[PDB]
Amino acid sequence: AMKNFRLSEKEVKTLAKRIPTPFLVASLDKVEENYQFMRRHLPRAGVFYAMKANPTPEILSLLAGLGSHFDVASAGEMEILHELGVDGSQMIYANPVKDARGLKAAADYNVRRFTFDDPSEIDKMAKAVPGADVLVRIAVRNNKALVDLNTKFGAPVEEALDLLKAAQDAGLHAMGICFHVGSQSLSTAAYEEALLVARRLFDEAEEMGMHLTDLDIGGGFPVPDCKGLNVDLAAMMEAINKQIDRLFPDTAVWTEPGRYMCGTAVNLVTSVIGTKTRGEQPWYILDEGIYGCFSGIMYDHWCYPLHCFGKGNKKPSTFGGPSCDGIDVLYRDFMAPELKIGDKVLVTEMGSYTSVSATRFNGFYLAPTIIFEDQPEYAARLTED
Amino acid sequence: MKNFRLSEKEVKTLAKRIPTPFLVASLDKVEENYQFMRRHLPRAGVFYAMKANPTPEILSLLAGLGSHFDVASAGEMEILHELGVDGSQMIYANPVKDARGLKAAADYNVRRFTFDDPSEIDKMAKAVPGADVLVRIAVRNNKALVDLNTKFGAPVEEALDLLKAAQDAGLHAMGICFHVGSQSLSTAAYEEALLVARRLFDEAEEMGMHLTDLDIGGGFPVPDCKGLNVDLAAMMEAINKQIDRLFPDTAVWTEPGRYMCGTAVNLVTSVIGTKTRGEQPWYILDEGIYGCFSGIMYDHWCYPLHCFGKGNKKPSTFGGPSCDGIDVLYRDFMAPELKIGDKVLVTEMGSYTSVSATRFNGFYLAPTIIFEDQPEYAARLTED
Ligand SMILES: Cc1ncc(COP(=O)(O)O)c(C=O)c1O
Ligand SMILES: Cc1ncc(COP(=O)(O)O)c(C=O)c1O
Ligand code: NA
Ligand code: NA
Ligand code: NA
Ligand code: NA
């Protein structure tokens, strides 16, 4: 049902005349639409936005103003939110293994909601923020996750209540259970299964006199790649919500979406800076590559949808980035029209785990994130409606 | 002669004073690396490929030693400019340039370029009319870690045509360059490339196009977790001997990156968490694959890790501090029992490491501390 944010060819042209490539263009209205869709289809799970996916300040402010909470991974992330006026009470420090700077930032900002998955974490947490609310993260199954989040993270389920009891012994507040099924999950069942497991744990805790009040179901909601998205997100979210109503009518339930919130709200605009026409497969060199926004190729095993403009015949083509490294090859055997130096191409669904792993390799600048609603092209869309 | 390596004592005293993670660079080791190259490869003047490590004190050291610089972008030119390096000292050796880079080259009077395609000629001639150009040719190497000859390099049969077209656009056809690949374990690749270049210089002479300069690129290797079987002295002497034989009347240059600093930097990082439940213990470190260990991903690399202290070792896993499952750095690594707060040391970490670090998950970039500016250095000089 929902439309992904996509710039038109005309918009690409006018934007790139004004702004030097490469740049990202983010639609706040599409971030908002994504937040509201999750509120509509998954009403039971309050949102802690996993800003690790995309920390663009205007996005964070938008989300804060919509009532979102935030999942923070580091001191840096807390500091960003603090400078935007967000109180520590709206944060969960959900990195199960915290460092000294992070714990100090948490104390400074009155962040007192933590996750953990190991006994070695308890004394660090109890010392930095005594009496903090803690959710123990359990390791869960998922046969359809792009990124496994249950080997490096997550306690065995049979240690969960023992960990909560040890944290309680150290003066922390044993508040509940969390899990993350893994990133880019194409499984709804994984959420349903984790929910049943947590239900049994909550019941066993109650008997021990520990009363658990909060359940955090993590993120993993998927976004379309160069082959679309083979999941119906509304049905996924409704099925999760149904299982939460079924099992957890009286518990405060929460979610930590990262990828989903902005993935479909951001486009990359990049120019062809060189061609190589010799031989059978042409090459085009772009001004953005694998050490910038296309770093998700490497870290996130990802294939982004590339759009070329032009109505003539297409042939298999290679696209590379602007660095001096051989690894900087983005697409091979990609059906493309004949492009020339100065042509702009468009990459859609570029909002998540892209700019956050960009670098200044070879001294290139970080591509900036342009706010679409501040540009005359947005206004032109409003008037066209 | 030997790698820069902090002792355990030095690690402990540094880490009491500087929060982990941090890199420590030895300027004296960089200088020793530069001098070693001057000694064993005297015929090739150095354009330092600062893409490997652009730490400002290193660049300033190198500039003070008389090094030139290979720049890959506007940003790199800007860094050198702020350090008072003149554009005469730079080669803009990215074969495919962008608008900002060409504008910076113009502003700073950088007038030496490489290229490998006819589509690059007009860009260069517009930006810096009359610039000196070297045409980059594609060459073979079956012992390179990183292939620098598929994305880059013109076919040899196109080279002189490219120089002539450059001439037609008013650029100065100065000569030929090549890069055999990064982490080359072959000396032959260099000797064979020199031979190809020599045939082209012979042919260009017969056409009345007299070429004056040859740039042989980089690729000199650095040790990894398994060390290094290449004798660097012998590789450099072999190359130099071929330069003397085939290019006695040509100005020859080299563009080392990795070699210059790779052996001059160490990383210090703390254990921030343990996981003992397994048959195999895990240790979580405060630096990972989204920081200086990014070379695991982009550079196919394995770094030498040193753990300290005592007792029986068992196979252990080390992960980084991110929330990502991919942030696993070593598996089945024989390590002693470590605890939260213990420091570990990674050596030979100076090249293509901090340069591909990120602020993923909001972590700060690990800073580069200059060893020579630290009491630990003075203390080594007091000993001696
Ligand atoms: C604790 C936590 N919350 C939220 C997220 C966001 O995940 P996704 O982008 O798959 O929704 C992650 C992903 O790494 C995570 O580790
Ligand atoms: C143009 C150029 N010069 C020099 C180098 C340095 O290579 P190395 O670090 O292997 O010496 C590179 C590596 O990408 C390069 O592209
Ligand atoms: Na159990
Ligand atoms: Na039950
Ligand atoms: Na990267
Ligand atoms: Na990286």
Numbering used by the authors:
A (entry chain A): 0 to 384
B (entry chain B): 1 to 384
In the authors' words:
Lysine decarboxylase (LDC) is an important enzyme for maintenance of pH homeostasis and the biosynthesis of cadaverine. In addition, LDC plays a crucial role in the synthesis of cadaverine, an important industrial platform chemical. We also reported that, due to the flexible PLP binding site, the protein undergoes an open/closed conformational change at the PLP binding site depending on the PLP binding.
We selected two target residues, Ala225 and Thr302 located at the R-loop and its neighboring region, respectively, and generated the SrLDCA225C/T302C mutant by replacing these residues to cysteine. These two residues contribute to the stabilization of the R-loop in the closed conformation by forming a hydrogen bond and are considered to be located in a suitable distance to form a disulfide bond each other when mutated to cysteine. To structurally confirm the enhanced stability of the PLP binding site in mutant SrLDCA225C/T302C is derived from the introduced disulfide bond, we determined its crystal structure at 1.8 Å resolution. As expected, a disulfide bond was observed between A225C and T302C, and the PS-loop and the R-loop of the mutant showed the closed conformation. Moreover, When we compared the B-factors of the PS-loop and the R-loop in SrLDCA225C/T302C with those in the wild-type SrLDC, B-factors for the PS-loop and the R-loop of the SrLDCA225C/T302C mutant were much lower than those of both the open and closed forms of SrLDCWT, indicating that the stability of the loop regions are significantly enhanced by the engineered disulfide bond. Interestingly, the active site loop (AS-loop), that are known to be highly disordered in both the open and closed forms of SrLDCWT, showed a clear electron density map in the SrLDCA225C/T302C mutant. The loop is stabilized by extensive hydrogen bonds with the PS-loop. SrLDCWT and the SrLDCA225C/T302C mutant showed Kd values of 72 and 21 μM, respectively, indicating that the Kd value of the SrLDCA225C/T302C mutant was increased in 3.4 fold compared with that of SrLDCWT.
